[PDB]
């Protein structure tokens, strides 16, 4: 089987991107982010606490025929932003683009976080990270993908974000008409239960390459990238006026500036960010000042290849014995 999904930036900065999903019988569809570093599928649900649903499309699984209680099993979950959702578990019937999962774990929030309650765009998240990060306790939960794999012609999925634009998940296929050239697969450690990977350096604009190892992870559900401070410091460099601001949290530009171009290294092979995919606009409205797409990772404790980085390529995620990653130019 195959499976073949639109994503859709949720705004005019892609900060994120939602991908419709189809829950329960009949079909519940909810617009769900789809997260390579998390391993939770959550919705907003019945039994969202009301004052924290605003605007969401919520799962109701009491109208649904297929759905089933998890007895005794609860979920909570801390992402790297300092956002937070919690509940109960159903399983039920699943199905994204076309691929359909029975008995995946839906878990229904009870609770949510602020920055969840304030997006109205986005109704949960679905994880596509290693199921070892699953938070469902006591008897941990399969992601979509670790329960679809084994059906699926080929134990991959691909994420071709688009800047500005809509692009493309795929399941259980490599569409060889998605991007240019080859591409360069590298390996995966799942030590940490994500999509974990070396760079093997990069370029600021027309500049040398410079060759050092980049330890981070390939996320779709982080909106920016974030690169040791050496790193970004000297991208930044290049941009007159741009700085880092203690107040606003991290590297902001003149808003008149022509941001360079960012290149990152995946094996041999180059992938390049344009200048204008690293330009997240004014920090307040009406503001003259920038906030910028590349940012440090100093304070998270790990480098993340999120989506500035990752809609520069066609990303193959190899979920076979072995996982490993590919990235193709575009």
Do not use: M
Not at 243 to 267: D, E, H, I, M
Not at 283 to 294: H, Y
């Amino acid at each position: 089987s195959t499976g073949s999904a639109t994503t859709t930036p949720i705004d005019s900065l892609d900060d994120a991107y939602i991908t419709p999903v189809q829950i329960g019988t009949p079909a519940q569809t909810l617009n769900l982010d789809f997260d390579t570093g998390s391993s939770d599928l959550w919705v907003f649900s019945s039994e969202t606490t009301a004052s924290e649903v605003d605007g969401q499309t919520i799962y109701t699984p009491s109208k649904s025929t297929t759905a089933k209680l998890l007895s005794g099993a609860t979920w909570s979950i801390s992402y790297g932003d300092g956002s937070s959702s919690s509940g109960d578990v159903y399983t039920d019937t699943v199905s994204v683009g076309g691929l359909t999962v029975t008995g995946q774990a839906v878990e229904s929030a009870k609770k949510v976080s602020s920055s969840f309650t304030e997006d109205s765009t986005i109704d949960g998240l679905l994880g596509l990270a290693f199921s070892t990060l699953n938070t469902v306790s006591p008897t941990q939960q399969k992601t979509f993908f670790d329960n679809a794999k084994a059906s699926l012609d080929s134990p991959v999925f691909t994420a071709d974000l688009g800047y500005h634009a809509p692009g493309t998940y795929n399941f259980g296929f490599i569409d060889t008409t998605a991007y240019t050239g080859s591409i360069t697969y590298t390996a995966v450690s799942t030590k940490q239960g994500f999509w974990e990977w070396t760079s093997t350096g990069y370029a600021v604009g027309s500049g040398t390459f410079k060759s050092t190892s980049i330890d981070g992870i390939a996320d779709t559900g982080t909106t920016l990238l974030y690169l040791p401070a050496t790193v970004v410091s000297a991208y930044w460099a290049q941009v007159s006026g741009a700085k880092s601001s203690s107040s606003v949290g991290g590297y902001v530009f003149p808003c008149s500036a022509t941001l360079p171009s960012f290149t990152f290294g995946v094996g041999s092979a180059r992938i390049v960010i344009p200048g204008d995919y690293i330009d997240f606009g004014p920090i307040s409205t009406g503001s003259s000042s920038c906030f910028g797409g590349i940012q440090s990772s100093a304070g998270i404790g790990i480098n993340i290849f999120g989506d500035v980085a990752l809609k520069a390529a066609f990303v193959v995620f190899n979920g076979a014995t072995t996982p490993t990653l590919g990235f193709a130019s575009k």
